[PDB]
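Researcher: We're reviewing a set of sequences before deciding which ones to prioritize for further study. For each one, I'd like a predicted 3D structure that I can look through quickly. This is Fanconi anemia-associated protein of 20 kDa. If possible, include the structure in token form so it fits the rest of the review sheet.
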Amino acid sequence: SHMGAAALRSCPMCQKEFAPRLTQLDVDSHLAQCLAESTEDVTW
Ligand SMILES: [Zn+2]
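Model: Here's the predicted structure for Fanconi anemia-associated protein of 20 kDa, in token form for your review sheet.
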């Protein structure tokens, strides 16, 4: 599947950039907390 298993180097959910020191596990770590928050309506 195309839109199934992929790997990103940043967080397009909150427009965040992952540092170079971070590992594959780190990226997924935040990717889970980001989607877990479901807060994509930041109006500040
Ligand atoms: Zn995020």
